[PDB]
Amino acid sequence: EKELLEEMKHPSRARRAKARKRLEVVRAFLDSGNRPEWMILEAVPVLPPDLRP
Amino acid sequence: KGEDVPEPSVPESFRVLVKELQALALDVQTLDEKDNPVDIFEGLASKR
Amino acid sequence: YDGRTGEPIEGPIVVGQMFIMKLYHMVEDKMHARSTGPYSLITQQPLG
DNA sequence: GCATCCGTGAGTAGAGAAGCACAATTTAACACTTTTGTCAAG
DNA sequence: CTTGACAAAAGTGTTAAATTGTGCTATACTGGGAGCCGTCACGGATGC
Numbered sequence: 001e002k003e004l005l006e007e008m009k010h011p012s013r014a015r016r017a018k019a020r021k022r023l024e025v026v027r028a029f030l031d032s033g034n035r036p037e038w039m040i041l042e043a044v045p046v047l048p049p050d051l052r053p
Numbered sequence: 054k055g056e057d058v059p060e061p062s063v064p065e066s067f068r069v070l071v072k073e074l075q076a077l078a079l080d081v082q083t084l085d086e087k088d089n090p091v092d093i094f095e096g097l098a099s100k101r
Numbered sequence: 102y103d104g105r106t107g108e109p110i111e112g113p114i115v116v117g118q119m120f121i122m123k124l125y126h127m128v129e130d131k132m133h134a135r136s137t138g139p140y141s142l143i144t145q146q147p148l149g
Numbered sequence: 150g151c152a153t154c155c156g157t158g159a160g161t162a163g164a165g166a167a168g169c170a171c172a173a174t175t176t177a178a179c180a181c182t183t184t185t186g187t188c189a190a191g
Numbered sequence: 192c193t194t195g196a197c198a199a200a201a202g203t204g205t206t207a208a209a210t211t212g213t214g215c216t217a218t219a220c221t222g223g224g225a226g227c228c229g230t231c232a233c234g235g236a237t238g239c
Contacts, residue, residue, distance in 0.1 A: 038078075047076040051069055053142050065145040131163090149163080 001026050063093050 004026060007019040029036055071093070074081045083091045092099065102109050139148045 041078055045076045045078055048072055051072060051143055069144060 001030065068093065 001023065004019045004023040008016055008023070010016060010019070028034070071081050071083075083093055085091050135147070140146060141148060
């Protein structure tokens with residue numbers, strides 16, 4: 001987040017726009033408490049059998 | 054019995070949606086005014 | 102002439118013989134009602 | 150700035166194609182008590 | 192209300208057949224297959 005904030009001060013509009021996209025994702029994980037490695041599955045949930053009868 | 058119908062409860066389709074969302078590795082939880090989890094499954098899906 | 106009153110219709114009416122068909126869409130095969138009945142397996146909603 | 154590929158969306162009802170050998174596990178047929186249930190006795 | 196004893200019902204321990212799981216076949220064999228198509232506009236990104 002600190003590095004992306006520093007890039008947000010770059011005078012190029014494209015650089016600021018790209019940094020904003022990354023920092024929105026970064027701040028979403030920070031505020032919600034979600035842990036980024038949870039986007040990779042180690043255990044796959046199995047739907048209850050009556051919902052797949 | 055000649056009585057008025059009672060107050061309704063949560064639809065079973067919403068329960069299906071929550072479980073299907075959980076099958077997508079998404080933690081969908083219903084909360085109350087105080088952000089505490091509320092069990093809409095009547096304790097039938099809680100492990101002890 | 103009007104069969105209810107016996108008085109003539111105030112203006113002449115186009116009366117003739119025309120060929121009219123009876124179509125397959127009949128109210129006997131289309132009327133349906135249900136109070137309670139079969140429900141879906143997963144959604145538990147009434148069938149269609 | 151621009152050109153391109155990918156992704157998204159596009160009305161509601163109803164009616165409609167190997168054997169075979171052998172071991173390992175399970176099923177089913179028995180016997181067995183052992184257990185409830187029951188109709189005499191007070 | 193207790194015998195009580197008694198047969199049916201049920202439980203139970205063996206044993207058999209039956210069903211099921213697994214291993215193994217020794218000429219040589221060494222990079223697949225089906226599609227392939229008549230929509231259109233719209234973001235959004237991805238690079239140029």
